[PDB]
Amino acid sequence: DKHGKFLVFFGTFVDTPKLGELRIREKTSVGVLNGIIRFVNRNSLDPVKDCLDHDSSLSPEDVTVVDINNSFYFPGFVDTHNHVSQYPNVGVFGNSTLLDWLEKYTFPIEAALANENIAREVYNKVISKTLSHGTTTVAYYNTIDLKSTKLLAQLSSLLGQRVLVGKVCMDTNGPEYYIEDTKTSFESTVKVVKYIRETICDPLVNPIVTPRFAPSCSRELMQQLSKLVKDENIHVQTHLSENKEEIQWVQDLFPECESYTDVYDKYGLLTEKTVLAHCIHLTDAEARVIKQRRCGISHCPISNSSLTSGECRVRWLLDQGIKVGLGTDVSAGHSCSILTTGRQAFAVSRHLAMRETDHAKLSVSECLFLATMGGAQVLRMDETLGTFDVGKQFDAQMIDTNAPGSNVDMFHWQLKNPPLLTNEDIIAKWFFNGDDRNTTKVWVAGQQVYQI
């Protein structure tokens, strides 16, 4: 436990303060106290003295130095969309697309997690696994079950991950074994919000109102949830414009509205803290509404490709000023890793560029931005998360490209006559061939929550 202890981390710090930038700070000291970065000193010669210069009140006794050539600190990844309850089905989907996959795999597994013994095992596994891949902040969809959603929030608090935890709302178009009535769906949401805020009462654990998607939620439910969201200033998360059959269904179910996006708009769910997953098939008018309402988009490339949903037009969304982050979308996406997700965002953008010009491509640094600051923006936490900057939370991971078993390797003669690698090249090697085995330590709010 590091509360009350002044920390200073010394070494190389890599982050992405602006889309397209990759900031690499060598031989740098980062002072941290009670989870908050207090200073960042490049070319630091004396990390302890940097702390004493920063605060007259300190003595050398009060300072803990943490010392990092092939290693660097990187911010924690932000997973803006993850159905923790679906994790038993990662890799399991066959030839199916969205609506068949929901019926065949997803409602069955979510219903099964009403068993607290199963749910506890799944939650412990997913929180620990995502942390081990460097995910420090995650927006979780759970299930319609109040009690299991409360357990997920409790275990999140215990294990030290930064989370938003949602009870899924479904009062229409679900199987009889896995559906709510309207009053229960609303009242259970009120209870979970109060329980998280007043009982769990942990700055790292937030509620989030979670209408599953428009086919699952009546107009009455959406309007009731809207009012709660407004009155209590709560995050919202839902799916939008993922699959062509889904979109046709929404049009058939809500023909009084102009579009899928207009359904959420008219029934009050589009806010500055609304996280919209997928957003593939949007019209220009829909994207314009999203921009105007200041919602954020969770780009889920692994799911989108795996379920043959489509290609998210990430550059087109960014070009309009919409904030975009990455989501794993477990289990439609098979991976718990936002690094894996970033690699697939890179690939998807090139499938689009094959037809839509090079403008559509995302660079390595842009994908790392989406994986960190982008997700922080989508969660309206970018003032406190996503980079190594004064005043922000020390949510961070240690990357060691020479960790045991690493698939990232570099020959001595490549390191600064044969061609030499830049620092940027080293980061790219981790981006493409790194995995969890290179994440050796993870900190959330300046507390070490994971050790390899």
Name the residues that contact a second copy, by CB under 8 A: 88-92, 94-95, 105, 108-109, 112, 115, 118, 121-122, 125, 129, 305-306, 308-311, 334-336, 344, 346-348, 350-351, 353-354, 358, 361, 363-364, 405, 407, 409, 411, 413-414, 418-419, 421, 425, 428-433, 435-437
Q: Which does 431 bind (CB under 5 to 8 A by kind): Zn ion, a second copy, none?
A: a second copy
Q: Which does 329 bind (CB under 5 to 8 A by kind): a second copy, Zn ion, none?
A: Zn ion
Q: Which does 330 bind (CB under 5 to 8 A by kind): Zn ion, a second copy, none?
A: none
Binding test (CB under 5 A) with Zn ion, winner from 329, 366, 382, 400: 329
Cα separation, 41 vs 302, in Å, equals 38
Q: Is 242 annotated as belonging to a binding site?
A: yes
Q: Where do breaks (C to N over 2.5 Å) occur in the chain, by preceding residue number?
A: 68, 416
Q: Is 83 annotated as belonging to a binding site?
A: yes
**Based on CB atoms, which residue is closest to a second copy, 92 or 253?**
92
Is 79 a binder of Zn ion (CB under 5 A)?
no
Stretch that binds Zn ion, among 68-76, 324-332, 343-351, 397-405 (CB under 5 A): 324-332
Is 242 a binder of Zn ion (CB under 5 A)?
no
**Based on CB atoms, which residue is closest to a second copy, 89 or 206?**
89
Q: Is 329 annotated as belonging to a binding site?
A: yes
Q: Which does 223 bind (CB under 5 to 8 A by kind): a second copy, Zn ion, none?
A: none
Q: Is 334 annotated as belonging to a binding site?
A: no
Q: What is the enclosing helix (H) or strand (E) of 451?
A: strand 447-451
How many Cβ atoms are within 10 Å of 69's Cβ, its own excluded?
Answer: 10
Q: Are strands 168-169 and 235-240 parallel, antiparallel or unpaired?
A: unpaired
Q: Is 241 annotated as belonging to a binding site?
A: yes
Q: Which does 432 bind (CB under 5 to 8 A by kind): a second copy, Zn ion, none?
A: a second copy
Q: Which does 389 bind (CB under 5 to 8 A by kind): a second copy, Zn ion, none?
A: none
Helix count and strand count (H, E) for the chain: 16, 17
Using CA atoms of 226, 227, 232, 233 in order, give the dihedral in degrees to the nearest 10: 40
Collect all residues with Cβ–Cβ distance below 8 Å to 263 and sequence separation of at least 6: 214, 222, 250, 254, 257
Q: How far is the CB of 86 from Zn ion (least distance, A)?
A: 8
Q: Could you give the residue ranges of the DSSP H alpha helices within 160-259? A: 182-194, 219-232, 244-253
User: Minimal CA–CA distance to 239: which of 259, 264, 257, 219?
Assistant: 264
Q: How far is the CB of 452 from a second copy (least distance, A)?
A: 9
Q: How far is the CB of 247 from a second copy (least distance, A)?
A: 14
Q: Is 314 annotated as belonging to a binding site?
A: no
CA 175 from chain centre, in angstroms, equals 29
Q: Are 268 and 242 in contact (CB under 8 A)?
A: no
Place of tokens 């390595």: 364
Q: Could you give the residue ranges of the DSSP H alpha helices within 133-243? A: 146-159, 182-194, 219-232
**Based on CB atoms, which residue is closest to Zn ion, 329 or 436?**
329
Q: Are 387 and 372 in contact (CB under 8 A)?
A: yes
Q: How far is the CB of 428 from a second copy (least distance, A)?
A: 5
Q: Which residues are annotated as a binding site for substrate?
A: 83-86, 212-213, 239-242, 329
Give the footprint of Zn ion on this chain (CB under 5 A): 329
